[PDB]
From Swiss-Prot, chain C:
GO terms for molecular function: 5S rRNA binding; structural constituent of ribosome. Coiled coil: none annotated. This is one of the proteins that binds to the 5S RNA in the ribosome where it forms part of the central protuberance. Belongs to the bacterial ribosomal protein bL25 family. CDD domains: Ribosomal_L25_TL5_CTC (cd00495). InterPro entries: Rbsml_bL25/Gln-tRNA_synth_N, Ribosomal_bL25/Gln-tRNA_synth, Ribosomal_bL25_short, Ribosomal_L25_dom, Ribosomal_uL5_bac-type. Keywords: Ribonucleoprotein, Ribosomal protein, RNA-binding, rRNA-binding. Pfam families: Ribosomal_L25p. One of its GO terms (biological process) is translation. Part of the 50S ribosomal subunit; part of the 5S rRNA/L5/L18/L25 subcomplex. Contacts the 5S rRNA. Binds to the 5S rRNA independently of L5 and L18. This is Large ribosomal subunit protein bL25. It comes from the Bacteria.
Length: 94, 94, 93, 92
């Protein structure tokens, strides 16, 4: 049950909602497929990321959405799942 | 040579300008210090990252700003722990 | 100005993508928000002619399925031997 | 939302203790075309607004009489205490 992650249904989706999650150690995600409508969730960033080097992570994981367990599979959609290391840097003259 | 990086002087600030650099494999930077005016520059992301493992990088590197070589020193780069980052994922129900 | 008409792609094969690029098009994908990912096709020259304006990287509108979807350019894939945009990612805002 | 930012004139242990005494925490403002500046912000004033999405959209730091539009870039909370140790703000 190590591949079992708690998912929180997102309330805010406007400006700064994603940045808010990041500073709270989270990141936004979308759960879809089937007859049920898509559900926007928030997952623990470092907890999810630490499993993304395991082959079975891309096979099947479990998201606990509001108590109910939901089996999902990550989709290869975005070109680069991992984002740039450096966003800004300061340099001092020596 | 290895610690020699091309620095393009930024002319466009404001909203969207930083994302534009990111989509071109670059990131915004500021060169300050001494008793001269600060200058906004753009650097190649991977070129810098591929040198951030070497101790010399944190001692002294050279930035080519407008054709002239400027000896600078990176500031507070090691402040935050560096980890793989994700800002979005897609999951399908199985 | 920053509003572009998008065509939903139903054929997602490698062949279909090249057939787009062969006629002023290029494949793109839209994801994020509270909706499932959507594969679309955009007019090449129309998009490219606006990628010099910094507000293109601020916020643009894609008309998908008769609906206006506010997105940001998330990724840009360019040709190795040509000045053509091969593929793009757009994230919803 | 506007927050009062005081440009720090002293650094170190004693300087930090005086900030923790005035109900303030150390913060850094960088980005744009200006040098990074170390500032001091009211702890409770900032923390009580970090539950609003507007705080992460755009806030204004009043630095030296100048209104500086910024975004909260990074945050450091205590190891087990419900308070903020340090924050980073990027200029927008």
């Amino acid at each position: 049950n190590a591949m079992k992650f708690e998912a929180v249904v997102r309330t805010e989706l406007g400006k700064g909602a994603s940045r808010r999650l990041r500073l709270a150690g989270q990141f936004p995600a979308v759960v879809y497929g089937g007859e049920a409508a898509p559900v926007a969730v928030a997952l623990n960033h470092d907890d999810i990321v630490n499993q993304m080097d395991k082959p079975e992570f891309y096979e099947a994981i479990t998201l606990v959405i509001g108590g109910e367990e939901v089996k999902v599979k990550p989709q290869d959609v975005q070109r680069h799942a991992f984002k740039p290391k450096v966003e800004h840097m300061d340099f001092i003259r020596i």
